[model samples]
Target: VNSFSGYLKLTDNVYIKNADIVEEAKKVKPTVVVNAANVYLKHGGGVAGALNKATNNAMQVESDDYIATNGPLKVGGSCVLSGHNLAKHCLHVVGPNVNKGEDIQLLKSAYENFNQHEVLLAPLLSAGIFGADPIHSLRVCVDTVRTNVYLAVFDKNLYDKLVSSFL
Candidate 1:
């Protein structure tokens, strides 16, 4: 059922695609779109920025409350927020801050924490702005992510991983 370019079917139902986070941001459905988020949940840049803008900034107020009570989200941990007018649901997970040379395992835990959904749209957990090796991070996602997850990716390494995953 996936016609998107750079798409790879991991399971009969699971898949990976090289796509902009905004492409799926338009759909309000059963899928919960996950974004790399901080305790503040600021949409300053990266996938979170684009998705936040695409959703017309719907999660702002609740975002603060989220941090006040449930932050700072530990690496390898996550929480879901209502998309409001932005989407059906949004999953926010804390990455290991590859920018700071954080451990790879924590990022893996972050990826693992998102579960119990039929459909999920997630990006490479710590590979991009978070700054970890894309290939390694993708492995964490593949190994841990449960559900019919669509891993929207940008790095060539992630694309390569998808190609080799099922072969």
Candidate 2:
């Protein structure tokens, strides 16, 4: 099991290595999946754009996770900027960094082990980069990765948080 800590790095693939993802998912079976899409630090800062890249890669691998479910496996959600039509279940929290309270909520969600079809969407701003703030970065890291998938905004602080907390 992974220890809960404050702030996690969003960009490091090491944290989300396929084996880790499967193991965590098996352990948690989380209801919500959290993640970040874009930022200046990674992928030129565009959530939609980053999703596009991810989807493309997923498609190449025939990944059902990224594909929308048409039959019993429907991938219902929003894929646009307004954050209106992305996934089946989504939590959109605006942030400048996530604070301590928000961090606690995220951890609670992870531990609760909610239902199967829900997801959490979070945006990670550039904390300590391009004049971005750390608190805001912390907020995104904590809020996003509670349940299933955490899409980090690819910041060093956020990545560090994930490593120190989960690994």
Highest lDDT model number: 1
- On TM-score, the leading prediction is 1
Which 10-residue window in model 1 sums to the lowest lDDT? 1-10
lDDT of 1 at 47: 82
Worst 10 residues of 2 by lDDT: 71-80
In order of listing, the candidates' clash counts read 1, 33
Which residue segments of model 2 deviate by more than 4 Å?
A: 1-31, 34-45, 57-131, 139-153, 161-167
> What lDDT tens digits, residue by residue, belong to model 2 across residues 1-167?
33312323344321222122222333444343333221111222334234324434432232233333321211112221221122332222222213222232333233222223234323333332223453444444444434433433444545555455542
- lDDT digits (tens) for residues 38-100 of candidate 1: 656876788888777776777666787888887666667778888665457888887888777
Full-model lDDT for every candidate: 0.72, 0.32
Q: Roughly what TM-score does model 2 have, to 2 decimal places?
A: 0.28
